[PDB]
């Protein structure tokens, strides 16, 4: 009854950040030590919780949000951040309690000639609310005239490919991100630490 963290962290395919993936964890023992003892991660930040105290806590659900962004944007996956990722793609609440985990995925997500399969939302009329997920492809009005769903001058498609090439500087290299959220509702607490 081990929690299937392997399915999240070792997934072959990861989501585009605009269309970020959420995995619900339930009905399992969570060995958090496999994550925090690991040398596979370069970012491992926990807000208002320490992965060492999770080992003797029980939750109703744990959520693992995952996507790819470029290296320079990993700082945006934090409470109170602004920028295209925090504003238009994936937003943490100001009072976030959870962990942000990232690692360089240049060996998997970059290719000679460029991998263009990972997308982000470049334009939006307003900022996302925390944990909001926008997969809409409405033509974005950038000018003073309405688009009526037709692309043209000042009337843009809202998504854009990242360009990951293995020779990119680390700031433009792909990073895989996992965000862990811990939930305790009015239900039996089915996700427990080994104690």
């Amino acid at each position, epitope marked *: 009854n081990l929690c299937p963290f392997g399915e999240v962290f070792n997934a072959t395919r990861f989501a585009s950040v605009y269309a970020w993936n959420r995995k619900r964890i339930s009905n399992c023992v969570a060995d958090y030590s496999v994550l925090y003892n690991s040398a596979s991660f370069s970012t491992f930040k926990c807000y208002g919780v320490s992965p060492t105290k999770l080992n003797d806590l029980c939750f109703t659900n744990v959520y693992a949000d995952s996507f790819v962004i470029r290296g320079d944007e990993v700082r945006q996956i934090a409470p109170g951040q602004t920028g295209k990722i925090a504003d238009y793609n994936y937003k943490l609440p100001d009072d976030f309690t959870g962990c942000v985990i990232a690692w360089n995925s240049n060996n998997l997500d970059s290719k000679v000639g460029g991998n263009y399969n990972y997308l982000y939302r470049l334009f939006r009329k307003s900022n996302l609310k925390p944990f909001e997920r926008d997969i809409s492809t409405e*033509i974005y009005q950038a000018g003073s005239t309405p688009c009526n769903g037709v692309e*043209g001058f000042n009337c843009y*498609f809202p998504l854009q490919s990242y360009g990951f090439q293995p020779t990119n500087g680390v700031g433009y290299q792909p990073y895989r991100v996992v965000v862990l959220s811990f939930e305790l509702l009015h239900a039996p607490a089915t996700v427990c630490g080994p104690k």
Partner: nanobody
Amino acid sequence: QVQLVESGGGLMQAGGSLRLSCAVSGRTFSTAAMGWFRQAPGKEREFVAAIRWSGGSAYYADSVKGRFTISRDKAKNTVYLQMNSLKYEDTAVYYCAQTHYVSYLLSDYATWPYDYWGQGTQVTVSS
């Protein structure tokens, strides 16, 4: 990878209309845009029209704007080039191309080097 197979070419009299097809198979979920290009004997390959897979907005070269129409059937993974008001200057081999590259800017599909290419279909316009 995707495979592009074009059909519908042939001989037509000037003033007529013809529809070319390009069927896409393989990794069809990756499709961002489709483009049509043409190459006349002794001339360089020339962009004709592009269509974004999501939403269906179209971009045309000046030489066909108002005459040709590009459309796509997502369910059938097929793009169409409706060639109306055919002229002698339209005689060429027509090639369809696919890319998974998403640009915010539709006009970039006129100059983007695409990922996969069809075999080409001959269109000949009679006097």
